Structure 1
Amino acid sequence: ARIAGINIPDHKHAVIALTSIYGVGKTRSKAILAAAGIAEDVKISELSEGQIDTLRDEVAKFVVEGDLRREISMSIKRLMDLGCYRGLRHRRGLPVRGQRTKTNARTRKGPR
């Protein structure tokens, strides 16, 4: 099936399949299934087909792939435009939470 605009694999468990959405981790995937009435030990196949569209409607209760992408982009751009410490450490490629960019800025500076 294709839930939330992405063709989730059919031959995987429902939790893992719905975890592929950009905006859900390993907890919201269980929570949505618990709140909508879907088991955590079945594949996309061997499941109600109307439940697919019910889940497609349910995943709109919070942020989604495009919504999360645009939210992150607008937050970063707002920080850059405001120009605080957050923006200064964001549009330079360095950690902003006070990490030492001396010997362990190694996936902010990239490989050397």
Structure 2
Amino acid sequence: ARIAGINIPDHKHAVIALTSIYGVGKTRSKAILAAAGIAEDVKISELSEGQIDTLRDEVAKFVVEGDLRREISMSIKRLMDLGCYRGLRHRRGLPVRGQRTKTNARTRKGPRKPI
């Protein structure tokens, strides 16, 4: 139930429950379950403690949760401190990957700010 410092859902299938970890998607969830030798359709509640321990051991091989968050923060901070074009885009909160700003860009710019 408690993996990588967080609680995973108990009533879901194992793959969906493992996706709740920050840094684990469907592909990594399948990889973890395959390396732990557990069927994906088995609910988390229907697992012995040793199986959960094996799941924790398998998850330990990936950079997840706070480690991943601080890695991402370090990368973004490095860009912003370098002051490259991507860093400036991150500073000003505009799309970083060359998307149009004349219209759209609402995900980066937040809700519309009337003049």
1:62 Cα shift? 1.5
Q: Over residues 7-52 of structure 1, what are the superposed CA-to-partner deviations in whole Å (9 max), with x where a residue is unaligned?
A: 1111111111110000011111111101210101110122221011
Q: Does 1:49 align with 2:54?
A: no
Kept in 1, the 8 Å contact 2:95–2:101? The answer is yes
Unaligned runs of 5+ in 1: none
The corresponding residue for 2:10 is: 10
* Cα distance in 1 for residues equivalent to 2:105 and 2:7: 37
* Cα distance in 2 for residues equivalent to 1:31 and 1:69: 21
Write out the 4+ residue segments of structure 1 that deviate beyond 6 Å after TM superposition.
Answer: none
1:55 Cα shift? 1.2
Q: Secondary structure at the match of 1:27?
A: helix
What TM-score do the two structures reach when normalised by structure 1?
0.95
* Cα distance in 2 for residues equivalent to 1:59 and 1:75: 23
Q: What CA RMSD, in Å, does the superposition of the two structures yield over aligned residues? A: 0.9
Kept in 1, the 8 Å contact 2:23–2:68? The answer is yes
* Cα distance in 2 for residues equivalent to 1:9 and 1:98: 38
Number of residues paired by the alignment? Answer: 112
What TM-score do the two structures reach when normalised by structure 2?
0.92
Percent identity reads: 100
